Paper text:
The 83-residue AcrIF7 from a P. aeruginosa prophage adopts a globular shape with an anti-parallel β-sheet core flanked by two helices in an β1β2α1α2β3 topology, consistent with a recently reported NMR structure of AcrIF7 (35). First, AcrIF7 binds to the DNA vise in the N-terminal domain of Cas8f and mimics the PAM duplex of target DNA. Specifically, D29 of AcrIF7 interacts with K71 and R78 of Cas8f, mirroring the phosphate group of G(–2) of the target strand within the PAM sequence of target DNA. D44 and E50 interact with K28 and R24, respectively, mimicking the phosphate groups of C(–2) and C(–1) of the non-target strand of target DNA. E38 interacts with R58, imitating another phosphate group at position –4 of the target strand. In addition, S80 of AcrIF7 hydrogen bonds with N250 of Cas8f, while Y36 and V37 of AcrIF7 hydrogen bond with N111 of Cas8f. N250 and N111 are reported to recognize the PAM duplex on the target DNA. This result suggests that AcrIF7 not only mimics the surface potential of DNA substrate but also the bases in the PAM sequence, thereby blocking the initial step for target DNA recognition by the Csy complex. Consistent with this hypothesis, EMSAs showed that AcrIF7 effectively blocks target dsDNA binding to the Csy complex. Interestingly, AcrIF7 and AcrIF14 can interact with Csy simultaneously, reminiscent to AcrIF2 and AcrIF1 which were shown to bind Csy simultaneously.
Numbering used by the authors:
A (entry chain B): 3 to 224, 239 to 322
B (entry chain A): 8 to 434
C (entry chain I): 24 to 358
D (entry chain H): 24 to 252, 258 to 358
E (entry chain J): 18 to 83
The structure:
Amino acid sequence: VTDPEALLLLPRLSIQNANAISSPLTWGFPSPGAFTGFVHALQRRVGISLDIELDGVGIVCHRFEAQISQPAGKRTKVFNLTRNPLNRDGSTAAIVEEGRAHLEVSLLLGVHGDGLDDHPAQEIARQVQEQAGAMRLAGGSILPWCNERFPAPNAELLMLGGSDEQRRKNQRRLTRRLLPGFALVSREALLQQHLETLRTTLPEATTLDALLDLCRINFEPPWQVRDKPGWLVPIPAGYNALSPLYLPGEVRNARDRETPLRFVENLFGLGEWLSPHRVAALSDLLWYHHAEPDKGLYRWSTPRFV
Amino acid sequence: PTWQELRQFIESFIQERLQGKLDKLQPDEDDKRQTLLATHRREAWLADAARRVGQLQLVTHTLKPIHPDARGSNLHSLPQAPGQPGLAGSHELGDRLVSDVVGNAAALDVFKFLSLQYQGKNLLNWLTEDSAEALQALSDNAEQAREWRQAFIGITTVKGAPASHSLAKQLYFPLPGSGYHLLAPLFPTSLVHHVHALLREARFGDAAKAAREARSRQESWPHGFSEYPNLAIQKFGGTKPQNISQLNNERRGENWLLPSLPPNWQRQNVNAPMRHSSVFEHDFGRTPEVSRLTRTLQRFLAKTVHNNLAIRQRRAQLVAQICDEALQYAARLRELEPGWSATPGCQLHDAEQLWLDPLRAQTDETFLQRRLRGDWPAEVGNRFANWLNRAVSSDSQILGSPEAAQWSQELSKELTMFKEILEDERD
Amino acid sequence: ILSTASVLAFERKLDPSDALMSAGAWAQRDASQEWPAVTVREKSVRGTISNRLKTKDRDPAKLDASIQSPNLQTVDVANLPSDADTLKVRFTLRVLGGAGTPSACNDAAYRDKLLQTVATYVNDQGFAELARRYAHNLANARFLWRNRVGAEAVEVRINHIRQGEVARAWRFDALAIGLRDFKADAELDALAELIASGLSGSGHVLLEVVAFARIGDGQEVFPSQELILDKGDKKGQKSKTLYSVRDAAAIHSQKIGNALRTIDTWYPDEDGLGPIAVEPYGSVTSQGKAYRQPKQKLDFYTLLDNWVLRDEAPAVEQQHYVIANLIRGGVFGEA
Amino acid sequence: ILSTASVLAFERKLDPSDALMSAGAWAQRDASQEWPAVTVREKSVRGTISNRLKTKDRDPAKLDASIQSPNLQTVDVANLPSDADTLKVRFTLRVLGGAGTPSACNDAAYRDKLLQTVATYVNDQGFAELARRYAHNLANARFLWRNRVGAEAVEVRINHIRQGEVARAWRFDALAIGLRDFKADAELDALAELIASGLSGSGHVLLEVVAFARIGDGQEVFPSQELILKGQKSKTLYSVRDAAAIHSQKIGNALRTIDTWYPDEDGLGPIAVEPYGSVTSQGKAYRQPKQKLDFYTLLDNWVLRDEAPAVEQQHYVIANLIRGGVFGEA
Amino acid sequence: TTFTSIVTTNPDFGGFEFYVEAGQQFDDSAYEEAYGVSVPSAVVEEMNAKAAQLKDGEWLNVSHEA
């Protein structure tokens, strides 16, 4: 929402069992809500001590390996599970299917505040890396890079540049540093205009049909595949209200009795895995929160993408 | 719209239930027909059915797919539409709600009774709008009719205080000012059933199987078809998917998740050229994706002008994706493998000098690093332009027209940005 | 009245990674950074049937016709190469810290009571009995699960990875240290104080646990096996899938954690098993039997409720079990 | 009442490796560490019809029409080179020990009774009859399955591998030691004592079994064959890393051909130790459960109700426990 | 095909489980209508003997594991 004064780069973090189930309709890379909740956890744990405000994540995903397996004779896939403990009686517990995946992402945390001036850049970069080393990103532990070739350090890029050329130089230097991955942005205006063209073709078509049409490899007869611009994916773009907002000590069995609970439901927007130098400014492509809590509509996106 | 036809329709449903019970009774003695015709025939069937409603619940967002030892709250609530454009889910269903049932499966006759389609709509939807046709048929006294109507309407209400079990999910959300909201999400099962119906119609439907066979005939069909690759199946009940919900009997588990995958979700291993034949076959090292991308550029030859505008924007996008995949191939080859400085030979295409960035500088300090920083090897783009001239054919309908000018200008600006990205490998 | 918090959840302390297994030769274990990874490859197996016939298939005709239609499987195997007799199993371990602070708790009164209880434990008897046993399951290579049963010599090397480098390096003989005796050893005590200072402070202590098992040339090593329901049709069915991280066999993270948690020798049943895993209603998956039943007053929930709510402090062994269940993590709470 | 456990998982003792095969010349078998491996290569074959017709294909018109269009295939063959006549099949055998202890069991009483039963077996008579037969199946090269049937002279070298070096090296003539008679030698009894000490848990036994089979110049050798998913690829051969190999369970099945106690005639000789003791080639299941001599009724009579069988049948039962398996009902 | 049974005092009405009321009888028609599978006729008398032998306020949970 606001512009970051600096752009921190947490380097390639190895996540071993992330959540492959991003949403009820999407499997694969975990939801960007996990990464925005991670940067809010980082702000809640060391952001208040350094007098900075870590907002926004650029999700890069150098490596992804889902713990899946294609069954024999089926085109679809199934998830490799774990073995839960037995019950108190000795029988096998009722299995619940949780998708696990191995990640390697690097995060662009947009850091703005009055703590960039108090501390050096390398100190606050090192302290948020040490705080991220004892955390988890989507349910999966962050592997801490022991006894390898060399440890990947951080770089807090002060985005306030003296010139346009030095700014473009350090943006290119950072893009070369997070290069083999694929930045994730939220392209929802493309989904809405594809819904507009779909409704032009056939009326009363809703945007779930436009989302599914942007998802699949659909064929057209003269046979030619309808082309897709980029790697468009369905992503859960936040939540939506189902119940009115309850009081803190009102709902039963909540997490805490001091925070208002509201029953919610996902909102599957459209995302687009694009390469990091297709953006020409890394102060875009960061994932912020947008709540508007009177209406529901607790959503996350990349504002200022285009 | 009159109460007499609704009355006789309800009596016909009750009598069909009793006739099915008597036909599947296999009785000859014990006089159970008297008790069955006293209970399951009269308007006391409405009485014990209205007693049975509190065992059921019409739901749209169940909890039980989240870990099935969870006794929380299940909601039949449709969200309001976001004013923000783009994103949507489960509020698009206006007249296509499938409307799951949770609760005691022994009381499913109440839901089958409220789901009869008597005039033009459900009996339940007749009971929500209090009319003359409603609340006159299901009794002769309006007091117990009002009581049974209030019972039947309660099939879509939350029973008890709102709750979410310790095994359920509930997630803090940072508000703009301060504070959080707990946000316990519920599994949208009517939306999952709708997307599951769309996916089953597009995969196993007859109108898609016909076009799929017409593709194998190589003939012409009116409509096309979809494919939906990389779907993952998630079943909710382990061995008993009956114990989750109503529609989880129809889709036996089987959530059918769409793929949200990054493009490097298939690990490609790295290979550097060793010998002269390896340097002739591995100078390019062309992945399946760039061949899939150049085959699309090969299908972008012919054009009419109003289509050639979008075709030129698509050709610019494809050359951008090819150049960017070349940049990522150079990136992962220069970073992952030390094989560019593994062995010496006679032919390794040493004019490239881009896929061996740390290989010739971090070991040789003044030998090749002084031949890469002052020379700044960026002549790889001129050799890379030969690949994209091989991607296009010899079509003279564009070579003797202004399409070659637009092609050359987009190629020049794209090799310009490829050159300035390739220029500063030294920093 | 201080009723039980309806939501309890503890974050997993002692969080290991996948145990990547790579192969090579003994007497160059000190140069083991370029050892090639043990790859998971397929092989085909024919079997004649051997399951117990259910007294209706004991006809000679049906059995003879069933040994002429054999089952044709495709199993995954992980073998050492023909010129390698040593298995380097290498994983990382974060000993996180904050072992009594729950990850989710409803009641602030229950939360403060539980934190006062765990602080009473840590002040009276800190993590020195638990961490000795975690250091033993690191020291003897119990995390080498079936790769230990006939190894010639197992040697475990543990490095306290500091900021970027090895701060303190251990080297154990994992066959001299048994699988059922938690004795006291000086280097094991130093590792126990390191895991103690990891479990007490707010920062994580990172170890690198490398174990070498001299199995033999070309022999089979045993990585973890993936739980795949719906294998598919029986034609191309792969009946056994071994876990591989990236063309490299590995034991799962929860399997290494299950071998590290095998410290519980305090259960009321006799110790024919010796130590079992720290579980609530402490249950052994291989035995198919849940010890520490709720019928006796010795499971984790009743010991925790008597310790926190009504101040009945259990025995020192049972509160070792309770705090080891807190370090293990979990999801608890009533409706 | 001591019913049988619902899981009984026995580990595989006598754990072999994939039998790699190389190639070289005889009389330099002693310097056979650098011999080139027998690579599996492809070749096309052309088959005519030779199967039994099903009384409707006996019309000469369709017979000649199907002969006129014969089936092409692409088999995998592994032959010795044209200058080599000896096949060096080299595997390692690790003898584990702890034969009667199951890896998984529900009942503690049944597990204890099984441990007492195997323990009173071992105390009454060690693993001396079993290890003599395992040592014979190592000495006579039955693990050379079809590479033995026409070999001129087979020689098996078995080395006890200690720390990294050879503790005691054997050298047998695999054709003098027959395929069906279990005689007694001095070196075979020393190998039997070594495998006995391996199975009793009183030592670590890692043998490296090398077997040279003088087949002939350029002849065909037979590794194990994979299952198959114009160029129909009718035979896919096993290969570990560009080197033909025999499967580990094939070598284990050849080592377990010690069972000469099956109730039928002993004209066939030893068969493989299996419950419902069966040979998949001959298609006949000896020790059918009608007769009281399969593994399951013998174990359930020896452990549950203490009807101890004869010495031969309990040798067979402990040979099945050394083999390992998935026993126990549902 | 394995029709288990458990007497529950409080039922789990959040899922689609089959609970028989204490003062009622098993209904094979309702089980064949709710779930797709039909009850075999040898399970019915066992479920009747369990459903009749029920204290007031004790539900009979009937489920198959096919």
